[PDB]
Amino acid sequence: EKVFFVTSPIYYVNAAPHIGHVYSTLITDVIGRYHRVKGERVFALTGTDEHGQKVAEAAKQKQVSPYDFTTAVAGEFKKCFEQMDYSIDYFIRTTNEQHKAVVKELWTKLEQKGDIYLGRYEGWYSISDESFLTPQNITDGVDKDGNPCKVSLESGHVVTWVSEENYMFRLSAFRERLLEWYHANPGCIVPEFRRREVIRAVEKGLPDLSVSRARATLHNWAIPVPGNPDHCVYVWLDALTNYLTGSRLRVDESGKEVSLVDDFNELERFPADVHVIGKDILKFHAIYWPAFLLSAGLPLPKKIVAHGWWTKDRNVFDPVEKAEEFGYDALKYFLLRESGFSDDGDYSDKNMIARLNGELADTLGNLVMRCTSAKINVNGEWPSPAAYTEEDESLIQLIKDLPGTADHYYLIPDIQKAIIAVFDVLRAINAYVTDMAPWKLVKTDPERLRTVLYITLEGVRVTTLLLSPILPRKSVVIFDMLGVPEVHRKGIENFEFGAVPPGTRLGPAVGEVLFSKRST
Ligand code: MET
DSSP states (O other): OOOEEEEEEEEEOSSOOOHHHHHHHHHHHHHHHHHHHTTOOEEEEEEEEOOSHHHHHHHHHTTOOHHHHHHHHHHHHHHHHHHHTOOOSEEEETTOHHHHHHHHHHHHHHHHTTOEEEEEEEEEEEGGGTEEEOGGGEEEEEOTTOOEEEEETTTOOBOEEEEEEEEEEOGGGGHHHHHHHHHHOTTSEESHHHHHHHHHHHHHOOOOEEOEEETTTTTTOSOEETTEEEEEEOHHHHHHTHHHHHHTEEEOTTSOEEEEOSSGGGTTOOSOSEEEEEGGGHHIIIIIHHHHHHHHTOOOOSOEEEESSOSSOOOOOOHHHHHHHHOHHHHHHHHHHHOOSSSOOOOOHHHHHHHIIIIIIIIIIHHHHHHHOTTTSTTOBOOOOOOOOHHHHHHHHHHHHHHHHHHHHHHTTOHHHHHHHHHHHHHHHHHHHHHHOHHHHHHHOHHHHHHHHHHHHHHHHHHHHHTTTTSHHHHHHHHHHHTOOGGGGSSGGGGSTTOSOTTOBOOOOOOOOSSOOOOO
16 A cells, blocks of 8 residues: 555746646646545645756746746746646655755666666757657758758657767667566556557667766756766656655645655655656656666556647647636536547637536536425435335436446546546436426425435435546535535545435525536
């Protein structure tokens, strides 16, 4: 039993935070939140990648010091994430002095294992991606000036030739072990088609990887190689090490770091159970990272999950403005509902309003009000049910199964599928409620209404619970309206049908609603 350790990528600070980072961190936040709902220990991690030529040259373009630049843009990332209302346990910065120490330790470990030698890298590089590319991954294109140039096929950013004496890591020696790893743990990369991609690439063969650069090239904005101050550590080896650092940091409740433990086992976080990443940074996490860890004699992460978006890029979205307009919880819902493992996503205002109105308001919202309405629930309490009809049983079955199903989806992790599963059950509850016409039963048959109302109430409680990682603020409101005690708002014990007893009283009236419909 360990601390469930989930991470987001750490984002370059060349520019202000935008939708892409918010999305990536959201996914990390949800996975964390679900596992806390199951009553597990969690450590969710996010932060900023502050070294390198890319970041240095952005600070240069704004005619400001790297220290001041990175610190300002970091504060912006932090402000954005506080504003987005996540439940992240720590925000790491690669400029952190304890992080630097961890990198040198890891470097020293790889060096002592014999896996680092002085060689040369002569070949193409994308500064914007901080990525080495072979000639098969470039093509002709254009720069900001409008001259003919070479560009990455990965991303379309400008590439440049590099010929440097660099320290090299023996990546080629780890090809077979990475392959054994991919096959022995077929869940280790998600979604499955990116697992195939990684195997195909490693199958083809692996060159050694440049893990240092000449200090002139990086404008001295990087961690020096231990025992060689002429060289700086590759920004990506620096960056990937944040996962290790984060796993070794004791943090106060204020969120500030206060100690770096010698040994990761001390905090029971490492290795990560899930690395959330974008599709643009797959090779670093599924090829380079496991190879460093194997060299270092460290344990590998359990899962890498690579979503359909980019970690970084240029339907314009200031996440905070859209949240101020449509709602924080609803914006998160929409991003998680609309985004599959691809770019097949419609983020138009039209479709956002359709989903807000269609699902959040009409399906979930309406259901809460019906089962809490003074009209239908005249006693304002959880009634004790009478005998169940077959129709009752069928809905009860769906509700009884929902947690196990949603659980598996959350553990893939495929949040979209989890959301869809909950809402399938919400549609079912509405259909039942339409059939039973409890408004009519209030007069006709109060005993039958007890049964119908209780099942409805319980369907709403369980669905809301399983949606609580997605709608953290609104789940609280729903629970308050239903009058569910705090103790029952968490824990797998409360995944069970019938956890909240008959006679529980509902919360007081607000009459403000849950999700107001936006005009079309
Ligand atoms: C260890 S994850 C580093 C990710 C990189 N800074 C990016 O924004 O893509």
